[PDB]
Structures are given as structure tokens and as C-alpha cells.
Amino acid sequence: TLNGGITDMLTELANFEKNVSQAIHKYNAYRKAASVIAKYPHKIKSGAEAKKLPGVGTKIAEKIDEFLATGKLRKLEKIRQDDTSSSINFLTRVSGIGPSAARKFVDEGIKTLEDLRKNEDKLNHHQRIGLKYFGDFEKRIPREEMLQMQDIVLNEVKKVDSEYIATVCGSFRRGAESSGDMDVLLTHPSFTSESTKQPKLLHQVVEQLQKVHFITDTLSKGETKFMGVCQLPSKNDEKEYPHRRIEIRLIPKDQYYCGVLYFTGSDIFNKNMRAHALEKGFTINEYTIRPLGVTGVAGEPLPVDSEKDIFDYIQWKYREPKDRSE
């Protein structure tokens, strides 16, 4: 946290561009800058110093000098005072309400938690669940609870079929002391890149979890991706645990490594790694790594027997999950 003030500033700017300006590239520019500065092992003393880092240009350098000299940024000061911006930024905090819907609601005069609650009939299913658990979704998940959550999911999945393999990825797998949610990667021998010998593979698991009352709500659900809400059981006379966001992503078993790589992140790490891959002549997704032809068209999937193999293809030294938190 040597540069917490600067990274917070850039993150706020990133959120402004994404949520209010709807300028996704500026949003990513700011996040990339915050990221590289977040790992820079020195307390930054000037914008010039910061500008030496990749992702930090002239504009950000200037902002860093202003922040260093005054402890704040006029641009953000004004943004915070702008009611429209503030309202739109707030609404996007509800799961399911993005930049477009927030601006629409604000036009309709809906700009507060109270307003949303009085207009629940104007929200789609996802948004409705997001509003319902607004508070809870704001709370972090102590790793201690993530461990209890992992135990339940793995045991319940085992009960459905001993051949399933559930792996908790995301921030949990990177060793984080607390997580925003639980990301579960799921595989079964019946579902491979070559065939699906068993339908409802994901359904059966979600069903078992609801039956035991672990999964309490559903945000979205397809044949390979489920996103919903879950809750740990509490004891007698004990206050209940906050509801938590959970996702179960079913991936073809023979494509496990590309899958766990993708699901372990971080998101910015994946962006950087996939970008590097392109420069090296490859393309990486959660299923495979393919070479790029002289035309740019992805070729056939290359053999993969470990996460490290993927790193080898792009000439990157292997990085443990804990060191991928960019």
C-alpha cells in the first residue's frame, strides 16, 4: 500500500470513465496504470518517476503530481459534486445494473436505494436479486468462511457424483485473505471437447446445492455457467452469515488447465497474459491456446498438460497463483 492514495485515485477515475463516460478503453487504461503502480516496490515521489512505468503516460503523470502536491485531484473533486455522475456511479453498484441502465434509471428519476426499492417492478431478475442483497454483496468474505464454503461445495458435489471435480479459483486460489465472491470451476469426465455423454451436468450440481439450502438465489444460469447467491448455515441463536455471490463454471475436462488459468486470474493478469500471447503469435481463451496463422486466423489447439505449458508457449516463466494478483 506504498502508493494507496495514487491507486485509489486512478481506480476512481477508471470507474468514472466506465460508469459515467462509458469509455471502456479509458477505464482499462486507468486500471492498467493502477495495477503497475500497485506492484511498483517504491513510494512514488513524482509523476516523472511514475511515467517510467508502462501504462503510465503524460496525462496520468500530471495527475500524479497534482495528487502528490495537494493530496487530491480537482477533476475528481468536481465529479464527486456532480449529482448525475454520483447517482449513475451509485446505481452501477447494484449487480445487474450497468452504465447503460444506471443512466436510464437516473433519466427516469430513479437515483437512490429507496427509489430502486419503490420501482422494483422495473428491474429484471438479476437486478432484483442484486438490489435484494445490496448490503451483503458489499461485504468481503473472510478466507475462513471461504474454506467452510469450499468444504460444503466439494462434499455436496461429491454426493451427486464422485467423478466431478470442483476447484475454487479466483482470488481464493491466489491465496487472498478475503474474497469478493466464490468462483468454482467444475469438470466431469462425461463433458469433454469431444462430447457430452451427460446432460444437466451443471443442473444436477446446482440442484443438490439448493436442496441442502446452500444456494438461495439465481442470478443467471446456462448449460455451462451458473451465477447465483449462497449462504453458510449458522448455529442456534446465532446471527446469520451474509449472503454471498457464487459462480459455478463447467469446463470440458480435457481443457482443465486453460480453464483454471482463466478462472484463477486476476482479470488484469489474464489481460496482460493474453496480450503477450498475441505478440508471441498465439491466442488464449479459457479452453485452449492456439497459434495465429500468417493471416491471423487461430489454428488448432496446442497440447496442454499443465498451466505451466501455457506459460512455456508464450515464453513466460511460470508464476504461481499468488503472484498473479495484478
Added chain:
DNA sequence: CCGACAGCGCATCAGC
């Protein structure tokens, strides 16, 4: 300068 910026699942919609 200037095009590129990672890659994709599910929900909802318009047009047919």
C-alpha cells in the same frame, strides 16, 4: 500518427 486495446457466457432485445 493510429489502430489496437482479451476473450467469452447468459439475458434481453429488434428485426424478421
Added chain:
DNA sequence: GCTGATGCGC
């Protein structure tokens, strides 16, 4: 109904 675009999120 379908396909394709778009919103939203991982």
C-alpha cells in the same frame, strides 16, 4: 420461433 446486436458480468 430464429439470428445478430447489445448489456452485463466473469
Added chain:
DNA sequence: GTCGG
């Protein structure tokens, strides 16, 4: 907003 060619 940043940057490689």
C-alpha cells in the same frame, strides 16, 4: 489514456 511500429 497509452503505446509500438
